[PDB]
Symmetry: D2
Subunit: 268 residues, 4 copies
């Protein structure tokens, strides 16, 4: 592959799940990939497996880690063409009264402000390279999700901030886009399902949520990212849905504790 | 009620279902309402029950009926303030290979071109009154629907044409908006459910499609219409969703004939 | 007016601008309105002018102020039917490198977490009343805005969180919706324009941004809010646009420092 | 290139403009491309220039031409993997009173029913190949356009029908997606600009409509199409925007004949 040959790419949270999918997709396209992750285990494993992937330990909520990540990427590689803000977390299901403003704040540090800080520090270099930014939002930013008020809020923020940055940076030719994956089968998905009374039933409901009848794969988000960076030169501020059609058509939305009348009083 | 007192309102398909809901809502607001319907039974009944509602027999696919409707409304009432394009039909479920281009054309005559013809003839009078147009689209125009390719297409057209008209008519101060109802309990809904092997199970799936756990009522669309005409003077080209939240969150979207793997191969 | 008679309504930032528009609209509908504002001047003025409007000093970023606001509203009035989260701020234009993570955080405290905290504390009472929540987001949450990365992000968060809450609260019958105003002529708009080299030229560009050719008024957002609370019982999780059509059609989007070729090389 | 090697692709309107962009992009990916066009000049030229591109004369509004196109593609190539419905026309600017129902109908035959007829006949073969459909809609389907009520309506229909087909065809694994290009520099764009009093000023306004400051190219839509067909296996029913950001941020929307007050009465 040569669609992104020699470009320098930073992927946050690139050590597993969707981030690793994106890392492999960019390596496959010929890029130099800086894996940024707070966990050294998965990243150093990719670094050793994929030459041209390199691991730099970095928590994106720690402003110094991000300055050092950026500082090292330029020092080590002389340029920066693409930033894929992927580091993010989804808490276990929580009703609104089970969330705290403190938890919300911590989650904004990761999902939103981490994405913002790396982008701020990266923009002077992306301007020189006429690079682009890719943020990994989520479909629930667009249509909501049950028991995930903080998470949904951070993803609504990422998608909107992507459009704001696209306007601020178009005078420099720097594109700024986001991918909104639906249900992607990842360790995070697996870890969350394992907290449920019936994990496999929960995973099954995850697959049935798509007209296509399955969850997506990290590789498929990785292809979407490589397309945005390498072949979508007239795309900026877009929200690319990788969702298997989950947002389409009617479905079972009234919840298992939601009072529903019998079908003889259909409209109350 | 006085929020729309003495304004002259035309409601197509106003003889039953959502159209009658809208007719009652405008009468309640003090308007003069011209009920336009191809069926005389339901309309003349409203005309007799509601003074200030008046029935004019008119098939909106028949250009002469629409010229005569418009011609009679001005002759009889001297002005035209509001056109609610509601006349529309939803065919029984049909797979794509069960539709014909002829059926599609007939359905466009009603759902789209009927709305277009009345609007064209009404605009010279709406310009003088600084009136507005309200089109009744559907949520499936926005998110699709199974087994309804022609219907969905006509509703995608209505929603888009609403925005085109809003731009063409804003120099005159004529607002042009649409309501996109989700599942509304109406005779049409009832007639379609009755074609199913299990009508009440189908109606129940209709109610479960909403987080609110019920279908909407015609009166609730009627309130939305009266709000658009009488109190939304800074609204034009909007799509007002009356859907009970159907478009929100994940749901059961993989269809009963869609191959789905077991939850041990979640992503294929 | 009687469309919301005797319901108890809290409006944050109700002391001027859009908040005061909403306060007057609910008072006009017959509600008991608790004006919540951090500035006593504008609120106490409304409290004295409008009986049935009452002012309670409260900064929504101060968790104790919000507990006390909620505690006093129930103690004083015995119920809570409607929360209009309107308190919000738009900073002066700032390029991305002119924003700080600290400023972003402060802005999230107001625009997002203030809305979240009042909603959390209000929900137990809204559940009993089968009330509803109305958040005042912004159109730029949906389509972005130049030189406003933090602000846009907080409004993307508000709009998404509205959908998350609508799902979490539909089992209780509590609707949760937002209004996304476009350009509304308010003191905040005036204050921001006054920071510009040519205020009136800037205000003029604000009016030209709408096909309707003007900015909106607070009263028009107030009507939209009263409609959501009092007549949109089948609406939840919707984004109601009060924008004068700003999001429609093509416009002048390439910025005054954006390199644009001459029209003989149209596509680069 | 090998991303779509040996797949059989039909591109309607493939003889020039965006269609030819898509044809070259698929040929470049290794596909067998059947150029379908009503004009033989541009298509036979591509057929001779690009081996593996083949031209079949076909007007998509003529049901027999489409049956013969489909019949010949299978007979000649034994399979059908991808249908790119691109044939479409944009009439010169027309106010609503300058359109006729007849013109509207003719435009629906091309833009909508042509897309529908080829898809119907192609689906039995796409099911066997687990192929996909790509419709070329337009951004104005989503946000409207001035003086283009019929055109906008047909494109609203194409985008919605894409979602309906995606639901109907997901049980077979057949993806169905659309691209919504903004302003793309093509012969059609050039022909329309040439009808204006100042063509180059009009082209310049076309470029300024994008934050990126230029129009798109056919090659860029071609890349988007090849991505949808060859690498977006978890995408169905999506609307991929190729618009240079035109839908983002505020712009000059109040039209040159739209009454606008001076900036001392900003909100009427
Ligand atoms: N899995 C899904 O279905 C899904 C859906 C929509 C969006 N997303 C988004 O995709 C991204 C990845 O999701 P996933 O399922 O692959 O997650 P994951 O948990 O499987 O992997 C996330 C990676 O990010 C790293 N990370 C976490 N916090 C970090 C921090 N502070 N600094 C640096 N690295 C950090 C983790 O160590 C891990 O390697 C997230 O932003 C998530 O919100 C996922
Ligand atoms: N019912 C729903 O759930 C639902 C959902 C979304 C949109 N809608 C739309 O709302 C509108 C009304 O739906 P409904 O369920 O109330 O339907 P309905 O069948 O119950 O009533 C429709 C009315 O329109 C009249 N009509 C039909 N064809 C006409 C024609 N050619 N000329 C004049 N009048 C004509 C009928 O005679 C009838 O009185 C339609 O446009 C429909 O697409 C309905
Ligand atoms: N003006 C516009 O064009 C526009 C457009 C879109 C959205 N909005 C939103 O509408 C809301 C009001 O905007 P506006 O133009 O009327 O603003 P404004 O400045 O004119 O009034 C805002 C009010 O909120 C109060 N407030 C501010 N911070 C507060 C806090 N921490 N606690 C309590 N009260 C607080 C202020 O004292 C003031 O009374 C904001 O949320 C804003 O983002 C405004
Ligand atoms: N140019 C733009 O800015 C733009 C923007 C949005 C969408 N689009 C869409 O993209 C498509 C192509 O646009 P373009 O600008 O490249 O147009 P174009 O006029 O430059 O080329 C269109 C091609 O389609 C062919 N065609 C027309 N009618 C046909 C018919 N009945 N049967 C078969 N072939 C037919 C023409 O002969 C021509 O080769 C259209 O569907 C258009 O609506 C274009
Ligand atoms: O849809 C999501 O955003 C999501 C993210 C991580 C894990 C499970 C999920 O459903
Ligand atoms: O959702 C619709 O458009 C609809 C319309 C009429 C009848 C049943 C329906 O689901
Ligand atoms: O569009 C906005 O969100 C806005 C809000 C406050 C002031 C000016 C504005 O344009
Ligand atoms: O935006 C469009 O759909 C379009 C299509 C063809 C020509 C010019 C255009 O603006």
């Amino acid at each position: 592959g040569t669609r992104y040959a020699g470009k320098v790419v930073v992927v946050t949270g690139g050590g597993r799940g969707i981030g690793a999918g994106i890392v492999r997709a960019f390596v496959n396209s010929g890029a130099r990939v800086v894996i940024c992750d707070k966990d050294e285990s998965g990243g150093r494993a990719l670094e050793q497996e994929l030459p041209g992937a390199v691991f730099i330990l970095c928590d994106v909520t720690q402003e110094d880690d991000v300055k050092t990540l950026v500082s090292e990427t330029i020092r080590r590689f002389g340029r920066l063409d693409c930033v894929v803000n992927n580091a993010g977390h989804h808490p276990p299901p929580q009703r609104p009264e089970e969330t705290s403003a403190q938890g919300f704040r911590q989650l904004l540090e990761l999902n939103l402000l981490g994405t913002y800080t790396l982008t701020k520090l990266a923009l002077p270099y992306l301007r020189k390279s006429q690079g682009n930014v890719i943020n990994i939002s989520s479909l629930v930013g667009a249509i909501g999700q049950a028991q995930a008020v903080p998470y949904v809020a951070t993803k609504g923020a990422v998608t909107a901030m992507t459009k704001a940055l696209a306007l601020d940076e178009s005078p420099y030719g720097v594109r700024v886009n986001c991918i909104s994956p639906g249900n992607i089968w990842t360790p995070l998905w697996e870890e969350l399902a394992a907290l449920m009374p019936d994990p496999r039933a929960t995973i099954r409901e995850g697959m049935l949520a798509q007209p296509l009848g399955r969850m997506g794969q990290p590789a498929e988000v990785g292809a979407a990212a490589v397309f945005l960076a390498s072949e979508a030169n007239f795309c900026t501020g877009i929200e690319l849905l990788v969702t298997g059609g989950a947002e389409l058509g009617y479905g079972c939305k009234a919840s298992r504790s939601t009072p529903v009348d019998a079908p003889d009083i259909p409209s109350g």
